[PDB]
Ligand binder design. Sequence first.
Ligand SMILES: Nc1ncnc2c1ncn2[C@H]1C[C@H](O)[C@@H](COP(=O)(O)OP(=O)(O)OP(=O)(O)O)O1
Ligand SMILES: Nc1ncnc2c1ncn2[C@H]1C[C@H](O)[C@@H](COP(=O)(O)OP(=O)(O)OP(=O)(O)O)O1
Ligand SMILES: Nc1ncnc2c1ncn2[C@H]1C[C@H](O)[C@@H](COP(=O)(O)OP(=O)(O)OP(=O)(O)O)O1
Ligand SMILES: Nc1ncnc2c1ncn2[C@H]1C[C@H](O)[C@@H](COP(=O)(O)OP(=O)(O)OP(=O)(O)O)O1
Ligand SMILES: Nc1ncnc2c1ncn2[C@H]1C[C@H](O)[C@@H](COP(=O)(O)OP(=O)(O)OP(=O)(O)O)O1
Ligand SMILES: [Mg+2]
Ligand SMILES: [Mg+2]
Ligand SMILES: [Mg+2]
Lengths: 430, 430, 225
Amino acid sequence: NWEHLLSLKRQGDTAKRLRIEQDDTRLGFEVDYDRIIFSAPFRSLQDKTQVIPLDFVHTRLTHSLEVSVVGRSLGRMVGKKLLEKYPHLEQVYGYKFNDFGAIVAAAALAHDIGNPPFGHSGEKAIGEFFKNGYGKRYKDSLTAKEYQDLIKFEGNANGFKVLSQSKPGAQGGLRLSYATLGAFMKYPKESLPHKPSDHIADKKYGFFQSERALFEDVAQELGLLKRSDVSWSRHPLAYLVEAADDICYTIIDFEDGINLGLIPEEYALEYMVKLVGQTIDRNKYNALQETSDRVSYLRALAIGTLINESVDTFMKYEEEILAGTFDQSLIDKSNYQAQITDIINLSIERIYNSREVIEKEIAGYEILSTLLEARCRALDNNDTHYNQLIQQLLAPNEKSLYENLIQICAEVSTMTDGKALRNYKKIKGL
Amino acid sequence: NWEHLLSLKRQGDTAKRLRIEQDDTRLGFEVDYDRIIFSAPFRSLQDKTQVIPLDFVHTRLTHSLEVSVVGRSLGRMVGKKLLEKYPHLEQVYGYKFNDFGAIVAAAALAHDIGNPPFGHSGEKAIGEFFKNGYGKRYKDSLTAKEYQDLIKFEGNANGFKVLSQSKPGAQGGLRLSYATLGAFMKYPKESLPHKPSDHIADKKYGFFQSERALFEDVAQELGLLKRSDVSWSRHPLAYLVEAADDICYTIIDFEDGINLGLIPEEYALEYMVKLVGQTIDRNKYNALQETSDRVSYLRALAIGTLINESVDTFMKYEEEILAGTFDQSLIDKSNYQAQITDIINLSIERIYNSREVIEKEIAGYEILSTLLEARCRALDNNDTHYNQLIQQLLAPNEKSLYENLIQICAEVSTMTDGKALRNYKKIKGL
Amino acid sequence: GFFQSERALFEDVAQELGLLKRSDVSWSRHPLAYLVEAADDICYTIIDFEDGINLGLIPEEYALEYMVKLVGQTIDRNKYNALQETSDRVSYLRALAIGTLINESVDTFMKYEEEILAGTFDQSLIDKSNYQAQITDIINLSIERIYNSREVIEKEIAGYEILSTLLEARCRALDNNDTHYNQLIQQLLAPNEKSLYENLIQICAEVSTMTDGKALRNYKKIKGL
Ligand SMILES: Nc1ncnc2c1ncn2[C@H]1C[C@H](O)[C@@H](COP(=O)(O)OP(=O)(O)OP(=O)(O)O)O1
Ligand SMILES: Nc1ncnc2c1ncn2[C@H]1C[C@H](O)[C@@H](COP(=O)(O)OP(=O)(O)OP(=O)(O)O)O1
Ligand SMILES: Nc1ncnc2c1ncn2[C@H]1C[C@H](O)[C@@H](COP(=O)(O)OP(=O)(O)OP(=O)(O)O)O1
Ligand SMILES: Nc1ncnc2c1ncn2[C@H]1C[C@H](O)[C@@H](COP(=O)(O)OP(=O)(O)OP(=O)(O)O)O1
Ligand SMILES: Nc1ncnc2c1ncn2[C@H]1C[C@H](O)[C@@H](COP(=O)(O)OP(=O)(O)OP(=O)(O)O)O1
Ligand SMILES: [Mg+2]
Ligand SMILES: [Mg+2]
Ligand SMILES: [Mg+2]
């Protein structure tokens, strides 16, 4: 039922928080966007890696801004078509098509807020620290599920924890709406069992053990269908966010590789022909001189056509998605797949395998390793003077072993690229 | 008349572009936001100075994002109250309160897009280059007005030029709506005469001589009242943007100075008492432990109360503002002024006069000086091999002397802090 | 080819060798100078091409397309295809082009022996060879993408500035050898009685003697950096 997925209540509330008893000046979903914009974890995203660590190449903030726009455009179309399909939503409860767009934009904006620095290599380094490092010492003292988290550290779970972190005086963290939290969650399941099927929603997990109760409350309120260990079904707005995010990195990474000197414009024109086919003006395209304008022009046309195709695909499978039987994404069920696959393969071949990227990944790999081992050694025995010095420097701000480790991981994931590099250099006296 | 200020036509159009003949999925003012988000000058803002050149301190992008939100909140309230006052706007033309919010947000987002690097010192360096530098050689070859621009380089005129820059194949630049352009312009006058009165709209100028025709067309379409040399009256949405922008830097700069170690929390609590008076919960305030949460909490309350007071002040003087007789801003006509003045004075005393800020300003001062003299020497005589080398390096991409100089200034203003520093170091072999 | 301070030495060399007088003094080229010029020409044209090919500024498609007639009747396709890395193939092509150009240059020199010895030959040996369009295309591509790279321009500008300051400092030191700073510069730059023209030419020769790294270090440590 759509009347239950669009929940407006927040943590610690006791009233009903009806839609028809609210001012349209500042909607509850818009307050979530305002809170995320002014947050400190969001502001720290300006110094984090998209593809090339450490210019005119995108970072983690612009990426989010772009996704926040595309997903808003997708969700607004989707909400308009649902209201067209379902008339009782706009007659009894009082919903409008802007609500879906606001929800998807709010979910899209903070969808990459808990990722560790140095991009893809940071999570692998954190996971390998507890497997082939000193962290293996803690294997015997933890249960199977907790050890699974630690050895398979995820950005989605860290983002959810950042969004819903309780502190003395601030209960619930940012205190976002339950609809936004439901749309933000992509893998509504625990860390075990590991990949029990080929479904799209069970490849990874979405929350730690310390946040099981909060997500259980969110799921119970939203009405997500139980599947099994606890596991639920995906929110359709999560599908929209995923599709928007997918279109963005695929196109933006392609064009970024094209301008930086690693891919020729011949591939740009050849691989993007059917996407920009019945939307282009050849006179305007030929009138341009610089390659950047042409690439932007193509990028602009591909994004529009992919947005329209994704909306059509979502409206095709509405009953299956709402029933929880849909086992794939929206991009993979689109007509244009060979070109997308070719673009992804070319980016993997020539962008992700460049020498500078590998060097920076190795450096981040080493830096995170030493930082984690230093934090663990400081935590272990808080007796020596050096350990006290490390505690005063790294973490100057009573809990069990599993919470202590997860807080260390979260603190490491909070630092930016430049801050981590400076800390690594000045802990070594360099 | 409000039916004429909310113009939807764009440069090069020939139809009417009526409001009642458009899809509500993607409004014309929302397309402006989408275009500005994906633009390259907007993406270059992530590397530009707010207060402290070259962390958790704001840059030029976050500042814009914050203003884009506050001004959107102000404009949406203002549009709701106008429609309440004027019923024929929503009955014949078909306008909604979201239109004003979208227009103000689009204007707010690109309001600081053409500012030179290194913040306040860059414009002063550019102006002094043509007065006490080599640029004085060009004084005799230019008219009074053109020389005035150059010696009084402005960020608003550069931003307007960036927004409305015509290129082969792309006529009109981003091609924004005329309402957004009108709301973006803060000083609708030429560079001469210099400060003819004490009005708020004639302290500086807003456009160069090369963009006089475009702004004349925009003004003629919008319906701005003629005042005089050409000069017009301010758009009320420009007042809203100005108030939003004012509240943001005053509060965000204050809190940034508070966390960086230059201002004690005693001033934070003492100077912010009446702003957060009848909106605070003492139990929640005392429950917090870290100073950052308390400062954010106060910042959150001050922004809300200032937003409400600014909306009330704008609605108080609607006839005077629309008639063009209003000679002040909206913040200066508010009850809370002594606290704002004290905060500004403290920031001037201890934030803007720090040793690091002065050192960075001097460095930027020197770097821009050498870059401008090198560009001028390269432009002058394009005969020697070194000059050709400089032309190939700095500007690798037929016009008169005044356009050549303004393009050089725009190109210098395009570079970021890090890019300019690297270019200065590697032109010197360092 | 020579300064005014070495006119007598070259006059003696020319008188002994027997070079034909043409005019101000001027003589005719030695044929061995033609051979040296041709050898030097073939080397930079081929070595610069291959160096641009390995550094990441030129695709192997141009390497194979522009070098087809040079390596035509000297190549073994089985051996060429058996190679895997691009460096071996480029070396292999470079090896074949150098040999064929050497043979063609020798043939061209032996064609015009009387004209060269009589001093009426007005061109080089490479420009009088059958393979010229490919050479011109290679040179144009190298000019377009190797000599116009950003790093090359930046380094040229840096060298441009460094030599300028070094020359002005040396001239200021030479001019008035009275002040303490001038004596310091003389002791540093040139620690080892002549007219104005010889003094300047010796300064130029001393500047031309320094290497890239030595000049950069001297420029940095004269500025206190
Ligand atoms: N429908 C869309 N919704 C959201 N973002 C979009 C959409 N289409 C494109 N984008 C992205 C990529 C575009 O370069 C940019 C601005 O869109 P827009 O100006 O409407 O497209 P465009 O450059 O193709 O214009 P036009 O309508 O003249 O073809 O935002
Ligand atoms: N192997 C790789 N090496 C480097 N960068 C990569 C690699 N794979 C992907 N990326 C980059 C491309 C994108 O710009 C960026 C963001 O993608 P990301 O969100 O991490 O992927 P995803 O969609 O598989 O993640 P998830 O399912 O965890 O949400 O990651
Ligand atoms: N009315 C407003 N419109 C836009 N931005 C606002 C507004 N009020 C505050 N802001 C800014 C500063 C706030 O810290 C942030 C989020 O606002 P919001 O969460 O509504 O305020 P708050 O923290 O005071 O909450 P509360 O309603 O519980 O008092 O955005
Ligand atoms: N003297 C100063 N030195 C350093 N920073 C300053 C100074 N004055 C103001 N700032 C900073 C504070 C703000 O964070 C930042 C942005 O203000 P800015 O937009 O330049 O001012 P303004 O409102 O006077 O400009 P304008 O009228 O040209 O639009 O400038
Ligand atoms: N005739 C030559 N005289 C001098 N140097 C030469 C000559 N031919 C080629 N070179 C250069 C480029 C060659 O890679 C390198 C070694 O020559 P060489 O081994 O005889 O040629 P090659 O690799 O073509 O062998 P092969 O005789 O098997 O074809 O010296
Ligand atoms: Mg993403
Ligand atoms: Mg501003
Ligand atoms: Mg040589």
